[PDB]
């Protein structure tokens, strides 16, 4: 238990990793969340796809840094993954520790309750998007790209965002398949 | 002395980076294999819930300390049987050198591929970033 | 701390395999054969991919012994060792081409020395037992009742 | 429980769908950074026979494939193309390799593939029967797809060596 | 002087290997290998040129048998035989026990017949001795020894009679 | 020499010795038996004895190589002196003093005195004009050398058991096998 999962996650945030002001990132995200609403003339849904699309490209880059530091092996169950992601990923990147619940028979999917969202839990949604936007979609999209870069082919999506007056915040992360990787040179 | 050569291996079974101390690219292809065949031999030949990986591979006159990714990036390096496992150096090379220069500036994408469904064979060591070659070559100045 | 020891056909085919201490087999007869074969090929591939890079002692153990002097190794270019987090395979091949490999549950330079000594001892064993058996057709699996006694006793002493 | 190991290697030329041929009978993947293997289990007189097949290839590694692989040979199931005649031309030169890497004892064999696409084939049956016979090497043929006669050729190869092993 | 158990072990195995290829039935092999041993057996008495100068001059049955198990094996196989048992069921039948025939060893557990060649040496010796035997080896008893085998030395009534007359 | 000491030191090992008479007799038994088999075609016996010796020789090298790990000799000079002082001392208590060399470095004789394999000269008037008794020995050598990829021709000349004096086997390294395990510059 040299590096319990929670403990590694915390040791990582504290003793070593580079940081920036939380507020600085918050506003930069706000420009992108807000910038898109103007650009997509109030079509909240167009934006979410946009953020989620943004989350994937960054997610692919980041999965690379995350592995570089924690040095974890490619977990084969969704569950080890659920655990690695919540104590390790969040703590290291957003000094946060989301939960893991609403698990379904087969370990199909597992939500990912974020009770404190450093990202944006201070916002007060305009009576517009209040019904369509998932402010933190880029966050969700980063997960999809990250899992995919380590073969887990999953489906990350919202069902609850405090922001939309929901009772909580819950990102579901379903597993679809595990991808293979090979090299044909000979008789193909 | 020290290390003989550095090879980075793509997640497409492709070769991204070389090192001494076009003719060369083929040797990597088999080396990708020596690592590939042994890696799987090691994967099946394991007991536990960890799923063992090839730490080091030794020969009569050299060694290929390996370090593999969960995203799929074989960092291979061939020693000269003098120093211990360059596992940390390899690890550091990938974490300090690779992530920031290579995959943090989304202005010039990662050597991934050419969409072409010839991913393993196709693709040429597009990893070129002026910094990467410079910082890495400097990092391995002595050893 | 050995768990598996095999002799790979002078031609790259598995003739002898005996995973014993653990007794929790995960590999099937057919696959073990393939593995020995792969070892044969990779053992081969490492030699060509050698760098532009253009003797042994004796700890007196494995079980007076068979040979007590610093002996001579021969394969100075083949896969002499594969080591991981779970073990350390030592491919000891004979001038006669034979490759005896000892798999050790323990991990890890002197560790290589032990196998060189232990395997050479087993090669020696193979010569009295395998070679003198009027009922043994070369490069063919080894169905010997006696070989198992001497190797198993040899594996326990080293253990 | 096995007792006899036989190393049979389909050596040939890359375009040839030789790998496909082995799969229909082989016991129960496809990783070539040397030469993929498929081992077959056929019982010959209570003496279980493990027929280990070296599906050797090479386009590069002609150098690597050859010195190590060929010598433990009790059978070499060589195959050409019945679609791309460049392949058949290859066999004449290829045979010379066997002459110096597998000692003269090696009992060989020749094979017919791409026998389902006669609607677009090339080299005919007579050309082949003479070349093989000229070399003291048999050649029965079989479709590219449903060609179960190949397997018997193997069982045939196995029994032949068992006779050698007396 | 002496030589390497390895060469002898080697010559013998080839000898047996060759013998195995000719003979179809195990029986012909056992009897034939024994004959091979017999010629060697006749030869030992012939070499004559603890100080039992038994030279054709009559000596009881046990004297030869006891001399033979203790003296010969150390001379041949190089290790005093193990035990010498006068049967307890038939008057002509005797038994000589060996732990590990310095000969028939490398050969794997079951195969008793290879063993016979050593037993044949016994038969030839006694036949020339002037007291025909019938040595038939057996791999059992196997107390604490995988291979300890006992050769069944059944005699011919003529020795039984010559002995009965002069006890 | 260095290698020369090893033959003697090796003799006190952990695979004991046996009385020569027993071994020599098993051999004399095989030769006599063989004669009967081939209707005294003495020649066939040499041929059959050599094949017999070869099958033994191939298996035998593992014993010699394992008994004493050694270098894959450089040339005939290296193998020959090694073979005579070392091998023979280990398997028989004999060491033939190599002699009679050939220009092309293709041959040398193994003149010998002590031949346990035939301490008793029962060479019968009908074969002693054309039959070599220690044939199994050459088979052991061809088989042993061919197995170390040094393909050569071993044969007899004079036999004490035959006509006059000195007995010797000649060795012809005619060629050298290509096929020999993966070992650097070999």
Swiss-Prot record, chain B:
Annotated GO CC locations: cytosol; endoplasmic reticulum; phagophore assembly site; TRAPP complex; TRAPPI protein complex; TRAPPII protein complex; TRAPPIII protein complex
Q: Which UniProt keywords apply?
A: Autophagy, Endoplasmic reticulum, ER-Golgi transport, Golgi apparatus, Transport
One Pfam annotation reads Sybindin
Claim: Endoplasmic reticulum is one of the keywords in the record: yes
Q: Which residue windows are transmembrane per the record? A: none
UniProt key word Endoplasmic reticulum? yes
Q: What SMART domains does the entry give?
A: Sybindin (SM01399)
Q: Where's it found, cell-wise?
A: Golgi apparatus, cis-Golgi network; Endoplasmic reticulum; Preautophagosomal structure
Q: Give the family per the record.
A: Belongs to the TRAPP small subunits family. BET5 subfamily.
Q: What is this protein called?
A: Trafficking protein particle complex subunit BET5
Q: Which gene encodes it?
A: BET5
UniProtKB/Swiss-Prot annotation, chain D:
| Activity regulation statement | Rab activation is generally mediated by a guanine exchange factor (GEF), while inactivation through hydrolysis of bound GTP is catalyzed by a GTPase activating protein (GAP). YPT1 is activated by the GEFs DSS4 and TRAPP complex, and inactivated by GAPs GYP1, GYP5 and GYP8.
GO annotation, cellular component aspect: cis-Golgi network; cytoplasmic vesicle; cytosol; endomembrane system; endoplasmic reticulum membrane; Golgi membrane; Golgi stack; mitochondrion
State the UniProt keywords alphabetically.
Answer: Acetylation, Autophagy, Cytoplasm, Endoplasmic reticulum, ER-Golgi transport, Golgi apparatus, GTP-binding, Isopeptide bond, Lipoprotein, Membrane, Nucleotide-binding, Palmitate, Phosphoprotein, Prenylation, Protein transport, Transport, Ubl conjugation
Question: Where's it found, cell-wise?
Answer: Endoplasmic reticulum membrane; Golgi apparatus membrane; Cytoplasm; Preautophagosomal structure membrane
Cross-linked residues, Glycyl lysine isopeptide (Lys-Gly) (interchain with G-Cter in ubiquitin): 136
- Describe what happens upon changing residue 57 to T: Decreases GTP binding and GTP hydrolysis
Q: Name one GO biological process term.
A: Golgi vesicle budding
Please indicate if the UniProt record lists DNA-binding as a keyword: no
Q: Keyword check for Chaperone, yes or no.
A: no
Q: How does it assemble?
A: Forms a complex with the Rab escort protein (REP) MRS6, which is recognized by Rab geranylgeranyltransferase BET2-BET4. Interacts with the Rab GDP dissociation inhibitor GDI1, which can retrieve from and deliver to membranes the GDP-bound and prenylated form of YPT1. Interacts with YIP1, which is required for proper membrane targeting of prenylated YPT1. Interacts with YIF1, YIP3, YIP4 and YIP5.
Residues annotated for lipidation of the kind S-palmitoyl cysteine are 20, 115
Swiss-Prot record, chain E:
Task: Give the chief site where it resides.
Answer: Golgi
Taken from the UniProt record, the cysteine pairs bridged by disulfide bonds within this chain are none
What Gene Ontology cellular component terms go with this record?
A: cytosol; endoplasmic reticulum; phagophore assembly site; TRAPPI protein complex; TRAPPII protein complex; TRAPPIII protein complex
Q: Which domain of life is it from?
A: Eukaryota
> Where would you find this protein in the cell?
Golgi apparatus, cis-Golgi network; Endoplasmic reticulum; Preautophagosomal structure
Among the GO biological process terms of this entry, one is:
intra-Golgi vesicle-mediated transport
Keyword terms of this UniProt record: Autophagy, Endoplasmic reticulum, ER-Golgi transport, Golgi apparatus, Transport
**Something else known:** Present with 8350 molecules/cell in log phase SD medium.
The protein's job, in short, is:
Component of the TRAPP I, TRAPP II and TRAPP III complexes which act as guanine nucleotide exchange factors (GEF) for YPT1. TRAPP I plays a key role in the late stages of endoplasmic reticulum to Golgi traffic. TRAPP II plays a role in intra-Golgi transport. TRAPP III plays a role in autophagosome formation.
Similarity comment: family membership: Belongs to the TRAPP small subunits family. BET3 subfamily.
Query: What assembly does the database describe for this protein?
Result: Part of the multisubunit TRAPP (transport protein particle) I complex composed of BET3, BET5, TRS20, TRS23, TRS31 and TRS33. Part of the multisubunit TRAPP (transport protein particle) II complex composed of BET3, BET5, TRS20, TRS23, TRS31, TRS33, TRS65, TRS85, TRS120 and TRS130. Part of the multisubunit TRAPP (transport protein particle) III complex composed of BET3, BET5, TRS20, TRS23, TRS31, TRS33 and TRS85.
Q: What is this protein called?
A: Trafficking protein particle complex subunit 31
Curated annotation (Swiss-Prot), chain F:
Pfam families linked to this entry: TRAPP
- Where does the protein end up? Golgi apparatus, cis-Golgi network; Endoplasmic reticulum; Preautophagosomal structure
**S-palmitoyl cysteine lipid attachment residues:** 73
Substitution effect: residue 73 to S:
Loss of palmitoylation
Sorted alphabetically, the Gene Ontology BP terms of this entry are: cellular response to nitrogen starvation; cytoplasm to vacuole targeting by the Cvt pathway; endoplasmic reticulum to Golgi vesicle-mediated transport; intra-Golgi vesicle-mediated transport; macroautophagy; retrograde transport, endosome to Golgi
Q: Which UniProt keywords apply?
A: Autophagy, Endoplasmic reticulum, ER-Golgi transport, Golgi apparatus, Lipoprotein, Palmitate, Transport
Query: What's the family?
Result: Belongs to the TRAPP small subunits family. BET3 subfamily.
* Further information: Present with 2370 molecules/cell in log phase SD medium.
Query: Quaternary structure?
Result: Part of the multisubunit TRAPP (transport protein particle) I complex composed of BET3, BET5, TRS20, TRS23, TRS31 and TRS33. Part of the multisubunit TRAPP (transport protein particle) II complex composed of BET3, BET5, TRS20, TRS23, TRS31, TRS33, TRS65, TRS85, TRS120 and TRS130. Part of the multisubunit TRAPP (transport protein particle) III complex composed of BET3, BET5, TRS20, TRS23, TRS31, TRS33 and TRS85.
List the protein's name.
Trafficking protein particle complex subunit BET3
Taxonomic source organism: Saccharomyces cerevisiae (strain ATCC 204508 / S288c) (Baker's yeast)
Gene symbol here is BET3
């Amino acid at each position: 238990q040299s590096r319990s999962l929670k403990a590694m996650g915390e040791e990582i945030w504290k003793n070593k990793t580079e940081k920036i002001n939380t507020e600085l990132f918050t506003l930069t995200y706000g420009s992108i969340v807000a910038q898109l609403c103007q650009d997509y003339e109030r079509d909240f849904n167009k934006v979410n796809d946009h953020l989620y699309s943004m989350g994937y490209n960054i997610g692919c880059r980041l999965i690379e840094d995350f592995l570089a530091r924690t040095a974890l092996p490619r977990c084969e169950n969704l569950v080890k993954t659920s655990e690695v992601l919540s104590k390790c990923a969040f703590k290291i990147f957003l000094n946060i520790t989301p939960n893991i619940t609403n698990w379904s028979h087969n370990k199909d999917t597992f939500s990912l309750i974020l009770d404190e969202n450093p990202l944006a839990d201070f916002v007060e949604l305009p009576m517009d998007a209040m019904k369509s936007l998932w402010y933190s979609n880029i966050l969700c999209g980063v997960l999809k790209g990250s899992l995919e870069m380590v073969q887990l082919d999953c489906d990350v999506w919202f069902v609850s965002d405090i922001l939309r007056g929901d009772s909580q915040t819950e990102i579901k992360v379903k597993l679809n398949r595990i991808l293979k990787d090979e090299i044909p040179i000979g008789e193909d | 002395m020290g290390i003989y050569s550095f090879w980075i291996f793509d997640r497409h079974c492709n070769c991204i980076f070389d090192r001494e101390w076009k003719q060369n690219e083929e040797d990597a292809k088999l080396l990708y294999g020596m690592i590939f065949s042994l890696r799987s031999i090691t994967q099946k030949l394991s007991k536990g819930s960890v799923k063992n990986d090839i730490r080091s591979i030794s020969t009569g006159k050299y060694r290929v300390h390996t370090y593999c990714t969960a995203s799929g990036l074989w960092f291979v390096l061939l020693s000269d049987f003098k120093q211990q496992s360059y596992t940390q150096v390899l690890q550091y090379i990938y974490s300090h050198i690779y992530v920031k220069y290579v995959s943090n500036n989304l202005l010039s994408p990662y050597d991934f591929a050419e969409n072409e469904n010839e991913m393993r064979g196709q693709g040429t060591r597009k990893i070129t970033n002026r910094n990467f070659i410079s910082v890495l070559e400097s990092f391995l100045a002595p050893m | 701390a050995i768990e598996t020891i095999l002799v790979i056909n002078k031609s790259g085919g598995l003739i002898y395999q005996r995973n014993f201490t653990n007794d929790e087999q995960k590999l099937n007869s057919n696959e073990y054969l393939i593995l020995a074969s792969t070892l044969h090929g990779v053992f081969a591939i490492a030699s060509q991919l050698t760098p532009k890079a253009l003797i042994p002692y004796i700890p007196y153990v494995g079980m007076d012994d068979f040979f007590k002097e610093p002996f001579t190794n021969w394969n100075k270019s083949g896969l002499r060792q594969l080591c991981t987090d779970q073990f350390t395979m030592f491919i000891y091949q004979t001038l006669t081409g034979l490759k005896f490999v000892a798999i050790s549950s323990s991990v890890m330079n002197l560790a290589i020395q032990i196998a060189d000594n232990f395997l050479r001892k087993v090669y020696c064993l193979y010569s009295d037992y395998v070679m003198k058996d009027p009922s043994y057709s070369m490069e063919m699996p080894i169905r010997s009742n006696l070989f198992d006694e001497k190797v198993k006793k040899m594996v326990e002493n080293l253990q | 429980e096995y007792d006899y190991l036989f190393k049979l290697l389909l050596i040939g030329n890359s375009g040839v769908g030789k790998s496909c041929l082995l799969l229909r009978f082989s016991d129960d993947y496809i990783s070539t950074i040397g030469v993929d293997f498929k081992i077959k289990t056929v019982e010959l007189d209570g003496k279980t026979v493990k027929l280990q097949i070296w599906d050797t290839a090479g386009q590069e590694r002609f150098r690597t494939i050859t010195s190590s692989y060929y010598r433990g040979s009790h059978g070499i199931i060589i195959v050409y193309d019945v679609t791309d005649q460049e392949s058949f031309n290859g066999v004449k030169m290829w045979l010379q390799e066997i002459d110096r890497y597998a000692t003269s004892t090696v009992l060989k064999l020749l094979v017919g593939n791409k026998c389902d696409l006669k609607d677009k084939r090339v080299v005919e049956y007579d050309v082949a029967k003479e070349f093989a016979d000229a070399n003291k090497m048999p050649f029965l043929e079989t479709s590219a797809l449903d060609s179960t006669n190949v397997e018997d050729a193997f069982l045939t190869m196995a029994r032949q060596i068992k006779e050698s092993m007396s | 002087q002496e030589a390497s158990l390895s060469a002898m072990a080697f010559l013998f195995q080839e000898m047996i290997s060759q013998l195995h290829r000719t003979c179809k039935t195990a029986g012909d092999f056992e009897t034939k290998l024994s004959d091979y041993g017999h010629n060697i057996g006749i030869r030992l008495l012939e070499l004559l040129n603890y100080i039992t100068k038994m030279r054709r001059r009559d000596l009881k049955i046990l004297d030869i048998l006891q001399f033979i198990h203790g003296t010969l094996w150390s001379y041949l196989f190089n290790h005093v035989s193990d035990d010498l048992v006068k049967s307890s069921e038939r008057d002509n039948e005797y038994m000589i026990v060996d732990n590990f025939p310095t000969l028939t060893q490398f050969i794997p557990g079951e195969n008793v017949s290879c063993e016979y060649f050593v037993c044949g040496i016994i038969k030839g010796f006694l036949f020339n001795a002037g007291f025909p035997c019938g040595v038939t080896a057996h791999r059992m008893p196997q107390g604490g020894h995988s291979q300890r085998t006992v050769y069944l030395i059944q005699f011919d009534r003529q020795v039984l009679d010559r002995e009965g007359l002069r006890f």
